[PDB]
Design a protein around this ligand. Structure first.
Ligand SMILES: *CCC(=O)N1CCC[C@H](n2nc(-c3cccc(C(=O)Nc4ccc(C(C)C)cc4)c3)c3c(N)ncnc32)C1
Length: 263
């Protein structure tokens, strides 16, 4: 699982943000890869290195694969399966108007398949959103970044009261207590379905973190996107039940969404 730096070539930068840079590159005797270089102080590298072997052994066609870690020199690098069409959020936004409702449901089905595998494996994603789903060949969607917020060091992103906390995808028990579970991932999956069927609109656009907490706690829920059928919006609302016990598991969601798609 440890990749020697001499086994990697960096060709072109494809993305950058808070936490680091992503390059298109090549991994010796293997394939084209996406390489993430980590900025110093952005992650607990030691905690990640402890968990890396387990994360790499997780394998499913609907999960973006971690191929290994280049840790011999600072900054460290993480090597991933290259996803030709980038993130789902931008893929939807840039191609708005070019999607059939069936295609959007099929994208949700792909994510649900990956999530049902994580649920069975007792892996909590913690931050499921269209921005971390990736698009491959033939519009296949894969889930990435499951469990990665465990390693983020900026308490403003990880604390439920942090100024950068991703509250838009958080269930009430997550924004209140950081009580993560596959059922809090189900809430996030409902928000992801809304992002997909709204063709990449930002959920609770213009609402502050405090406003999202108050609105959700008082029963507000995201409106029905134009492209979501009655049945699809009913499933979204089931993901947003206040009590995690009342939300469907991903095993149940996978069958429900497949039944809707198959007709
Ligand atoms: C919407 C996202 C975006 O703008 N794009 C375009 C630029 C390239 C981006 N991209 N990211 C990955 C990728 C997949 C899986 C994991 C990662 C990753 O870096 N995860 C991660 C690493 C460290 C941390 C710490 C700070 C804890 C958090 C998360 C990145 C791509 C792949 N595999 N292919 C293609 N483009 C990819 C998407």
């Amino acid at each position: 699982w440890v990749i020697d730096p001499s086994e990697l070539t960096f060709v072109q930068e494809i993305g950058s943000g808070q936490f680091g840079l992503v390059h298109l590159g090549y991994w010796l005797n293997k394939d084209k890869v996406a390489i993430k270089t980590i900025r110093e102080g952005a992650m607990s590298e030691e905690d990640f290195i402890e968990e890396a072997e387990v994360m790499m052994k997780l394998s499913h066609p609907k999960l973006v694969q971690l191929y290994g870690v280049c840790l011999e020199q600072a900054p460290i690098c993480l090597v991933f399966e290259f996803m030709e069409h980038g993130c789902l959020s931008d893929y939807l936004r840039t191609q708005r108007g070019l999607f059939a409702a069936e295609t959007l449901l099929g994208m949700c089905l792909d994510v649900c398949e990956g999530m049902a595998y994580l649920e069975e494996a007792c892996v909590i994603h913690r931050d499921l959103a269209a921005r971390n789903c990736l698009v491959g060949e033939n519009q296949v969607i894969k889930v990435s970044d499951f469990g990665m917020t465990r390693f983020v060091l900026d308490d403003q992103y990880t604390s439920s009261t942090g100024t950068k906390f991703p509250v838009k995808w958080a269930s009430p028990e997550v924004f209140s207590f950081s009580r993560y579970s596959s059922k809090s991932d189900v809430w996030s999956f409902g928000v992801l379905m809304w992002e997909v069927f709204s063709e990449g609109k930002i959920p609770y656009e213009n609402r502050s973190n405090s406003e999202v907490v108050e609105d959700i706690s008082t029963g507000f829920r995201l409106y029905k996107p134009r492209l979501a059928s009655t049945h699809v919006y009913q499933i979204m609302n089931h993901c947003w039940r206040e009590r995690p016990e009342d939300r469907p598991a991903f095993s149940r969601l996978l069958r429900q969404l497949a039944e809707i798609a198959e007709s």
